[PDB]
């Protein structure tokens, strides 16, 4: 029981955290591109005005 809890705590502290930071970083990469596409959207929808 003591082993199997350390085994599961390693999965939380190393692998799951490695997935969490890869998703945190990938959120920033998507938020910068949400601003890229919305700046280009406002230029496009306001063109000739």
């Amino acid at each position: 029981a003591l082993k199997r809890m350390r085994d599961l705590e390693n999965h939380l502290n190393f692998h799951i955290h490695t997935q969490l930071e890869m998703m945190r970083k990938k959120q920033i990469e998507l938020i910068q591109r949400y601003i890229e596409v919305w700046s280009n959207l406002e230029i496009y929808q306001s063109k000739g005005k």
Binding site: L2, K3, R6, D7, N10, H11, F14, H15, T18, Q19, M22
Partner: protein, 363 residues
Amino acid sequence: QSKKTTLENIIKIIDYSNDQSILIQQQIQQQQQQQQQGYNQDSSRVILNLVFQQLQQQDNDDFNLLVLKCDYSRPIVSIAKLIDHELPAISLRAIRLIYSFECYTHQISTVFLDSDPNLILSKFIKMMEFNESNFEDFSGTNYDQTISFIRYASNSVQWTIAQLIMLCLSNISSGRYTLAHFLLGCSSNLDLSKDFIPNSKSCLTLIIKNVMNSQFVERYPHLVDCYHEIIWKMSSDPITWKPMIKYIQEEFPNYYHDSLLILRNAITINGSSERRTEALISSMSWVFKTCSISIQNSYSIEMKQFLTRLIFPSLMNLNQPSMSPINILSLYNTIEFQLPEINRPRIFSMYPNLIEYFTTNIN
């Protein structure tokens, strides 16, 4: 679509070169077909060169000094499945990729537990097992680069695994489990306070059984100096010393006699080179210091017999047949305290302004 599939197609060839190595270790039971393997094998070798040339910009002070100014598990595990690849020039590529990957992470220990640690550890073991028949001497002057590159790619495997264990023992902050502790078989509770598993195969069981092979010591003296620095470090960390010295006394009680016997005999062989004598005398220091912690904390009946019948052999015992030797003085003169009179390099007289550029401090 075609602007994520680049690295995706490279990873599929690392996976498919494991599908193929599993299929070829099966189909060598039938294949007259070697001519068709080579394009897939060399494509796999070039992929493992190219990934190494993406790491060899981050294996660099200028990049880390730039960072100071501004799921890797599947990739690492599909590379680790190639550790026992049928071409040593692919095996050594997988092991040297894993070396760089541990330098950035110190977490290949958990990435191997979080996967199948048995199917991974057994591939390191399968590369650390000594085959005495893979041998013909490097005494011939006619060093063909083709045949030599294959023999280099072979014998570099155990040296790179030993140096991967050594790195993950030099880089310990106290109580941290590492890829060294994983390869040596320290308890998968991450628990450096618990004993080793007896009769098990880890890299530790192989390190000690290769050290006590006299032909392994004669053939590979620098690998034996390195192996003894592993034994010494595991015996001198304030946590693992108790599991380690207990495991030496429970599965290897001869170790401090048979290792001094083999090293002293390997030094006694005249016509050896200064660089063999270097490593065997270095290895002999590690045996003395590892024995010194065992005497200090774990003094046993085998240690009392070792000191009183071999190291300090009291004269009256010589006349009882009812069961040059290795005594304190015969050990001293095996180290040859005529030190070499180091001549000053002639280059320091050509470039006196560059002495501290032309040296490196080992620390």
